[PDB]
C-alpha cells in the first residue's frame, strides 16, 4: 500500500495520470477569440486586386465553405470529424463570449445595449460567411443519428441564434424555402423520437449495483443536455414572435411531405409525463426521498421546464 | 551439365575447395540474351560459400571449376537450375541460363 514499496515505473505512471488529471486538465487557455480574429482579418485580399469582391475569400469564409462542401457531399452516412468538432467548438466559444458575459452592481441599460452590440458583432462575424447554412446542412446530413457531430452542430446553432436575431432567422428560413428539402425536418423528428426519459428499472439496477460495492447518471436520463439543446434550438428559431417560422414548423409549404414538430413536442412531453408519474408511483410509499431520486427528479423537471418554454414560444405570438 | 568457356586469362592454380567464402561479379541472362542479373549495378560483389548449397548446384560447380582472377562464361541447363519452378516474374519455367563470372579475392 505505501508508495515507497512500489516499483519506479508504476509509480511514474501513477504520477503521470495524477498530474494530467490535476494540473494540465485544470489549466485554462483562451485562444478561440484571438484565432477567430486572426482568421477574420482579410489581409490584402481587397487591395492586391480590386476587380471582384472576395475574389480570395477570408480564411474563415474558406473554412466554412469547405465544411459546407463536406456537408453537401453525397454520402451513405455522416462520419466523425475531429477537425470539424474542434472548429465548431472554437467558433461557438468565440461567438458566445458576450452571451456568457466574457448582489451584482448596478448595470445601465446602455451597458446592456453595448454588450448586446458586442454579441451581435460576434454573431455577424460568423453568419456573414455561411455558418447559418452550415449548421442546417450538418443537421440534414446527420440523418437523425445522435452523436458528437450533431451535438456540436446544435451548440453552434444555439450560439449563433442567442438573442433570436431576425438576421439569421431570416437567412435560415430563406435557405429552407429555397432548397425545399425534407431531410432537415426528418432528421429533427428522428432525433426528437430517440430522446430518453426516466427509467426506474435502470434506476433499481444502478441502486443495487452501487449498494453491493461493484453510481452513474448514464443509468437514468442520459443525453439530457442534448435534449435541452434540441428544444433550445427550436425555441431560438421561434423566438421574437416570427409567424413565418411558427407556421413553417407546423406546415412545410412546397415540400412533398410535411412534419408536425408541434405534435412531436406534445408526444415527447406526454412520454416524459408518464415517466414522471411512474417515478411518483414508485416513490409514494417511501417516507424520505433518496438523494439519487432527488437528482433524477431535478433533471426530469428541468427537461420538462425547457419543453414548456418551447411550446409557449410556438404560440406566444397569436 | 554446366559448360565453361574462358574469356580472359586468370591467376590459375587456385580453385576454392569446400568451406571458403568467395566474392564474384556476375551477369546472368536467358538463352535469348535477356539480362536479369547484374552484380555491377548493385555495386557489390556477391558473397557465397561452397558446400552449404545456398546457391544452385550448377553455379556452385561452375564457380568451383574455374580459378582465381579468371573470367568465364557458364552455361547452366534447367536441370541444374530452377527449371520448372523458375521464378515468378523473372525466369520462365523452361530456360537455359548464361552467367559470366569473374572470380576474385578468394578467402
Amino acid at each position: 500500500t505505501p508508495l515507497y514499496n512500489l516499483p519506479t515505473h508504476r509509480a511514474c505512471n501513477m504520477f503521470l495520470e495524477s498530474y494530467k488529471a490535476a494540473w494540465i486538465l485544470t489549466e485554462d487557455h483562451s485562444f478561440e477569440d484571438r484565432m477567430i480574429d486572426d482568421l477574420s482579418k482579410a489581409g490584402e485580399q481587397e487591395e492586391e486586386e480590386e476587380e471582384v469582391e472576395e475574389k480570395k475569400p477570408d480564411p474563415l469564409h474558406q473554412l466554412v465553405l469547405h465544411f459546407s462542401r463536406t456537408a453537401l457531399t453525397e454520402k451513405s452516412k455522416l462520419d466523425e470529424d475531429y477537425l470539424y468538432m474542434a472548429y465548431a467548438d472554437i467558433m461557438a466559444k468565440s461567438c458566445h463570449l458576450e452571451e456568457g458575459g466574457e448582489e451584482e452592481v448596478e448595470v445601465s441599460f446602455e451597458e446592456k445595449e453595448m454588450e448586446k452590440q458586442r454579441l451581435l458583432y460576434q454573431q455577424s462575424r460568423l453568419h456573414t460567411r455561411g455558418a447559418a447554412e452550415m449548421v442546417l446542412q450538418m443537421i440534414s446530413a446527420c440523418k437523425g443519428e445522435t452523436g458528437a457531430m450533431v451535438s456540436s452542430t446544435l451548440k453552434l446553432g444555439i450560439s449563433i441564434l442567442n438573442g433570436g436575431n431576425a438576421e439569421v432567422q431570416q437567412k435560415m428560413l430563406d435557405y429552407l424555402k429555397d432548397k425545399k428539402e425534407v431531410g432537415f425536418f426528418q432528421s429533427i423528428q428522428a432525433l426528437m423520437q430517440t430522446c430518453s426519459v426516466l427509467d426506474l428499472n435502470a434506476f433499481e439496477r444502478q441502486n443495487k449495483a452501487e449498494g453491493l460495492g461493484m453510481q452513474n447518471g448514464e443509468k437514468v436520463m442520459a443525453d439530457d443536455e442534448f435534449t435541452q439543446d434540441l428544444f433550445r434550438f427550436l425555441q431560438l428559431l421561434c423566438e421574437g414572435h416570427n409567424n413565418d417560422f411558427q407556421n413553417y414548423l407546423r406546415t412545410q409549404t412546397g415540400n412533398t411531405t410535411t412534419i408536425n414538430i408541434i405534435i412531436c413536442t406534445v408526444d415527447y412531453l406526454l412520454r416524459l409525463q408518464e415517466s414522471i408519474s411512474d417515478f411518483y408511483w414508485y416513490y409514494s410509499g417511501k417516507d424520505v426521498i433518496e438523494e439519487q431520486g432527488k437528482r433524477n427528479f431535478s433533471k426530469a423537471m428541468s427537461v420538462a421546464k425547457q419543453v414548456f418554454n418551447s411550446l409557449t414560444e410556438y404560440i406566444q405570438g397569436p | 551439365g554446366v559448360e565453361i568457356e574462358t574469356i580472359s586469362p586468370g591467376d590459375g592454380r587456385t580453385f576454392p575447395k569446400k568451406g571458403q567464402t568467395c566474392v564474384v561479379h556476375y551477369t546472368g541472362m536467358l538463352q535469348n540474351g535477356k539480362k536479369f542479373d547484374s552484380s555491377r549495378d548493385r555495386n557489390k560483389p556477391f558473397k557465397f560459400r561452397i558446400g552449404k548449397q545456398e546457391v544452385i548446384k550448377g553455379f556452385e560447380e561452375g564457380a568451383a571449376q574455374m580459378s582465381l582472377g579468371q573470367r568465364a562464361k557458364l552455361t547452366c541447363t534447367p536441370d541444374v537450375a530452377y527449371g520448372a519452378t523458375g521464378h515468378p516474374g523473372v525466369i520462365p519455367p523452361n530456360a537455359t541460363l548464361i552467367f559470366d563470372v569473374e572470380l576474385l579475392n578468394l578467402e
Partner: protein, 801 residues
C-alpha cells in the same frame, strides 16, 4: 532516372514513385503505424532529456532548440531488409523482406538534389527540370519526406533541411528559403506534410521531457515519504495526531495517496499538503517551464509562429481550390494554437517501462506490427498462418500478462476483433478459433480487460451464428467470458441483448442444422446442439458467484414464457410431451444406431442434453430462499410459474431412470460409452440443482422415498466401481463428482430432517454402509473425500444410536 535532368515530367514522377514503392513503402508504413504510441524506457539516457536546451551561450533561457534535432528514447522497432539476389536456390514459409538499397548514399543524393532544385528555383529560368516547377519539386519533396519519416536523416541532415526550408528563423547562433518563393498547390501540400513531421517531433520531445521529469520526481517523493513515515511511526507521544496523520497520508491506495500528495496547486491546498516548500517549488517551476514551452504566455522566432503566419498568408494570397490542401493547412494551424490540448490527448498513449523489459517490449511491438499490417490485405491461407504464429507469440510473451494497462493502451483487442469481423464477413475456422481464444484469455487476464471487452458484447451477438457458435471457440464464448463471474456487468446487461439471444434460441428450434442435413443425418426440425450454446450463455448471464440475479432471471423467464418456441418440441403446447417421454425416446434412438447415424454428432445425446441445459437454466433462474421467506410477491410468482412449467414427477422419474455402467467382459474390460449417445450423471446433477432451487426437500417420507428411488442405486454402483480396475474407468470419477456436487450436500442440508425415522432402520443402515465406503473410497479428490466425511458426521448428528 533520379538524376536525369532532361526526362519528361510524367516519367520522372513515375520513376520516383516506383523507387519509393519498391524500396521504402513497407518500412515507412510500418514505422508510421508504430509512431502513434510513446513507450519510453526508464534509462539514464531518458533522464538526461531536458525540456529546454541548456544555456550554452551563457545566461540564455526559454530558447527553443531546432525541431527534430535531439535525442529520442521511445521504443521504435528497427527496419528489416533483404538483399535482392536471384542466384540462390529457391526452396509456412517466412515472410519475405523488402529489397535493400544503400540508404546512406541515397539520403545524401536526395539532399544534394533538393539543394540543387532549390537553387534552380531561386534562379529564375524558362526551362525547369521536368517541364514545370511542380514536376521539379514534388518528387524530391516526396522522397525527402519519406526518408525523414523513416528516420534515415541525421542531426546535421535535419539542420540542413531546416536551413533549406527557412534560413532566417532556423539559423544557429542572400539565400531564398522554400517558403518565400511562389509555389503551386502540390508543392504547398508536400511542404505541409514536411511540417507535420516537425510538429510531431516537438510533441514527442515534450512528452519525453515530461516522462523524464516524472522519473526524477518520483524518487524524491518516495524518499520524502519514507522520511515522514520514519518520523510518524516514532511519534508515540501524540497518539491521536499520529493516528490522524497515518489515516491521512498512509493506509490508503497508492493512487489516492499520490493524488493527495499532488493536490497542492492552490494556496489553501498547499497548507493541507504535507510536501515541503522546495519539493512543491520544483513542480511549480517545471509546470511553468512546460507552459512556456507549449507557448501559453515581425520576424517569426519559432515553428508555431512560422506555420501560423505561413498558413494565414497563403489563405490571404490565394483562394485555395484543393480540399486536401485546405484540410492540411487548417489541421496544421489548429495544432499550433491548441498545443496544450494535443499533449493532453497524447498523454493517454504514454507509458513507462523498466529498462530490463525493453527486449521483450520490442519483441511484442514487432509481433503487433505484422498483425496491424495484415489488416489491409485480404485474408488468405498464408496470412492466416502468419496471424496464428503472431498470436501464439503474443500469448507466450511475458509482458502480455504483466502490463495489461500497456496492452489496453496499444488496443490489440480491437485489432483482433476487426480481424475476426473481416474473416466472418465459415472460412478460416482456425483463425476464428485463435481470435476467440485470444479474446477469452485477454478477458481472463484482468477485470478492466473484461470491462473493456464488455462494451462490444451486443455486436458480437449480431456477428454470432449457429455454425459460428458450433465452432469450438466462438464470439458467443467470448461474450460468456466477458460476462462470467461479474455481478456488476451482469446487472449492466441489457434486455435487448437478452431478447436477441432468446430470438436466436427460438430460431434454432424450428429447423435442422445445415451441416447435419448435408452430412446426411435425419431431419428432426430443431437444433439441440444450436440451443446448447445459448442455454450456456444464458446460465452464465443469470448466475454469478453462486447466487441468482433476480432482474436477469425475471427478464429471461418472461421472454421464455412469452415465446414458448424456445422450449423445444416437447414441453410446448398440446403436442409437447413430458420429460419421461423425451428421455425414453432419446434412449430408444440411442439403442438404434442406424437412427443415430447419417457417428460423431450424437443427436440422441443432443436431444436430452438440450433439456438438461434448459432445466439447469431454469434452476439458476429460480428465486432465492430469503426472498421466498420474506414473501416477495414477484419472487413467489416466478417460483409458481416455474413450478407450473416443470412438474415434480418428471424430475423424479428422470432422476430414477438408470444409465449404462461399464463392467469387465471376456477381454477384461467391456465397452465404456460415455459422451457418445449415452446418459451422463451431469444431467441428473442439473436436475438435482433444479430440485434444490424449487420443489425443496421438506418431508421426511418424501426425502427417504426420493433417496431410495434415485440415489441409493448410484451409491451402490459407485461402491462396486470403487475397485481398482473398475475405478480406473473414466465415468467412475464422473459419478463421484456428480455425487459430491449434487447429492451429498443435499444430504448434509437435510440431515436435521432425518431425525425421527419410522421403521427406516435397515435402509438407513445400508445407506450408512454406502456413505462410509464412499468416504473411505480410493482415487478421489481430497475435497471430495472431505465432503463425504463431513456428510457422514452431519447425518450422524441427528440419528438415534
Amino acid at each position: 532516372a533520379l538524376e536525369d535532368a532532361h526526362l519528361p515530367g510524367p516519367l520522372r514522377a513515375g520513376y520516383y514513385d516506383l523507387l519509393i514503392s519498391i524500396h521504402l513503402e513497407s518500412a515507412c508504413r510500418s514505422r508510421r503505424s508504430m509512431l502513434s504510441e510513446y513507450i519510453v524506457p526508464l534509462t539514464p539516457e531518458t533522464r538526461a532529456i531536458t525540456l529546454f536546451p541548456p544555456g550554452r551561450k551563457g545566461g540564455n533561457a526559454r530558447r527553443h532548440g531546432l525541431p527534430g534535432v535531439g535525442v529520442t528514447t521511445s521504443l521504435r522497432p528497427p527496419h528489416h531488409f533483404s538483399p535482392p539476389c536471384f542466384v540462390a536456390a529457391l526452396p509456412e514459409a517466412p515472410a519475405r523482406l523488402s529489397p535493400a538499397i544503400p540508404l546512406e548514399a541515397l539520403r545524401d543524393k536526395a539532399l544534394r538534389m533538393l539543394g540543387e532544385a532549390v537553387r534552380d528555383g531561386g534562379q529564375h529560368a524558362r526551362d525547369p527540370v521536368g517541364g514545370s516547377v511542380e514536376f521539379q519539386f514534388v518528387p524530391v519533396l516526396k522522397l525527402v519526406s519519406t526518408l525523414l519519416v523513416m528516420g534515415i536523416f541525421g542531426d546535421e541532415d535535419v539542420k540542413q533541411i531546416l536551413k533549406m526550408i527557412e534560413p532566417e528563423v532556423f539559423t544557429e547562433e542572400l539565400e531564398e528559403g522554400l517558403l518565400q518563393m511562389k509555389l503551386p498547390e502540390s508543392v504547398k501540400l508536400q511542404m505541409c506534410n514536411l511540417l507535420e513531421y516537425f510538429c510531431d517531433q516537438e510533441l514527442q520531445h515534450r512528452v519525453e521531457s515530461l516522462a523524464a521529469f516524472a522519473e526524477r520526481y518520483v524518487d524524491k517523493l518516495q524518499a520524502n515519504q519514507r522520511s515522514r513515515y520514519a518520523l510518524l511511526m516514532r511519534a508515540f507521544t501524540m497518539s491521536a495526531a499520529e493516528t490522524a496523520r497515518r489515516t491521512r497520508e498512509f493506509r490508503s491506495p497508492p493512487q489516492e495517496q499520490i493524488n493527495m500528495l499532488l493536490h497542492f496547486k492552490d494556496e489553501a491546498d498547499e497548507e493541507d499538503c504535507p510536501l515541503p516548500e522546495d519539493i512543491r517549488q520544483d513542480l511549480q517551476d517545471f509546470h511553468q517551464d512546460l507552459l512556456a514551452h507549449c507557448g501559453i504566455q515581425k520576424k517569426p522566432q519559432s515553428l508555431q509562429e512560422l506555420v501560423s503566419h505561413m498558413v494565414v498568408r497563403w489563405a490571404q494570397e490565394d483562394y485555395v481550390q484543393s480540399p486536401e490542401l485546405v484540410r492540411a493547412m487548417f489541421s496544421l494551424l489548429h495544432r499550433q494554437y491548441d498545443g496544450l490540448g494535443e499533449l493532453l490527448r497524447a498523454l493517454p498513449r504514454a507509458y513507462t517501462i523498466s529498462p530490463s523489459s525493453v527486449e521483450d517490449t520490442m519483441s511484442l511491438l514487432e509481433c503487433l506490427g505484422q498483425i496491424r499490417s495484415l489488416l489491409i490485405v485480404q485474408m488468405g491461407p498464408q496470412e492466416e498462418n502468419l496471424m496464428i504464429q503472431s498470436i501464439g507469440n503474443i500469448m507466450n510473451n511475458k509482458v502480455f500478462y504483466q502490463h495489461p494497462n500497456l496492452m489496453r493502451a496499444l488496443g490489440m483487442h480491437e485489432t483482433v476483433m476487426e480481424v475476426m469481423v473481416n474473416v466472418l464477413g465459415i472460412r478460416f475456422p482456425k483463425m476464428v478459433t485463435s481470435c476467440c481464444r485470444f479474446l477469452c484469455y485477454f478477458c481472463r487476464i484482468s477485470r478492466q480487460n473484461q470491462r473493456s471487452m464488455f462494451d462490444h458484447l451486443s455486436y458480437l451477438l449480431e456477428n454470432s451464428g449457429i455454425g459460428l457458435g458450433m465452432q469450438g471457440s466462438t464470439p458467443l464464448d467470448v461474450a460468456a467470458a466477458s460476462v462470467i463471474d461479474n455481478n456488476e456487468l451482469a446487472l449492466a446487461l441489457q434486455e435487448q441483448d437478452l431478447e436477441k439471444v432468446v430470438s436466436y434460441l427460438a430460431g434454432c428450434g424450428l429447423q435442422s442444422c445445415p451441416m447435419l442435413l448435408a452430412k446426411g443425418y435425419p431431419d428432426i426440425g430443431w437444433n439441440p446442439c444450436g440451443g446448447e450454446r445459448y442455454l450456456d450463455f444464458l446460465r452464465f448471464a443469470v448466475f454469478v458467484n453462486g447466487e441468482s440475479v433476480e432482474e436477469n432471471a425475471n427478464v429471461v423467464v418472461r421472454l421464455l414464457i412469452r415465446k414458448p418456441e424456445c422450449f423445444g418440441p416437447a414441453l410446448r403446447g398440446e403436442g409437447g410431451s413430458g420429460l419421461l417421454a423425451a428421455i425414453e425416446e432419446a434412449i430408444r434412438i440411442s439403442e438404434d444406431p442406424a437412427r443415430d447415424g447419417p457417428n460423431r454428432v450424437h443427436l440422441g445425446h443432443a436431444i436430452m442434453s438440450f433439456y438438461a441445459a434448459l432445466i439447469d437454466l431454469l434452476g439458476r433462474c429460480a428465486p432465492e430462499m430469503h426472498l421466498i421467506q420474506a414473501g416477495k410477491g414477484e419472487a413467489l410468482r416466478i417460483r409458481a410459474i416455474l413450478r407450473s412449467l416443470v412438474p415434480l414427477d418428471d424430475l423424479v422419474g428422470i432422476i430414477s431412470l438408470p444409465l449404462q455402467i461399464p463392467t469387465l467382459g471376456k477381454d477384461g474390460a467391456l465397452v465404456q460409452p460415455k459422451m457418445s449417445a449415452s446418459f451422463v450423471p451431469d444431467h441428473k446433477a442439473s436436475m438435482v440443482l433444479f430440485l434444490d432451487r424449487v420443489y425443496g426437500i421438506e418431508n421426511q417420507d418424501f426425502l427417504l422415498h426420493v433417496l431410495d428411488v434415485g440415489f441409493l442405486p448410484d451409491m451402490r454402483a459407485a461402491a462396486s466401481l470403487d475397485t481398482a480396475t473398475f475405478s480406473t474407468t473414466e465415468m467412475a470419477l464422473a459419478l463421484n463428482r456428480y455425487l459430491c456436487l449434487a447429492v451429498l450436500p443435499l444430504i448434509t442440508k437435510c440431515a436435521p430432517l432425518f431425525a425421527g425415522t419410522e421403521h427406516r432402520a435397515i435402509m438407513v443402515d445400508s445407506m450408512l454402509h454406502t456413505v462410509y465406503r464412499l468416504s473411505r473410497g480410493r482415487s478421489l479428490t481430497k475435497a471430495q473425500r472431505d465432503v463425504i466425511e463431513d456428510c457422514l458426521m452431519a447425518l450422524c448428528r441427528y440419528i438415534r444410536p
